[PDB]
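Q: I have two molecules that I believe assemble together. Could you output structure tokens for the complex as a whole instead of separate predictions?
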Amino acid sequence: GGIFQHSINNSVDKVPLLGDLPVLGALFRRTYEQMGKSELLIFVTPKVVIQ
Amino acid sequence: SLDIPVKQVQIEARIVTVKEGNLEELGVRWGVMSTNGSHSVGGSIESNLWQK
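A: Yes, here they are, computed for all two components at once.
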């Protein structure tokens, strides 16, 4: 078996009209972004001892 | 007749969640203070008693 996980977060807080201007907008907003990924696996292997 | 090899199954669950949110607020704060000589205008009674 195994388990797989993934997650993505984005967020913005800005000034109602200025934080959207094409190049100047970056002066009127804070931007946050995060991404995570995880993976777990379990294997098994038997063998008969042939002396 | 009973003891025979059986089959095997692989089961996979998947849980997905999505969230969105929006918020907006507008507010205003203003005041005035004026005197004329025996006449005043303010934003309270303590205000008019202070500008004297």
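A: One point stands out. The radius of gyration of chain B is 38 Å.
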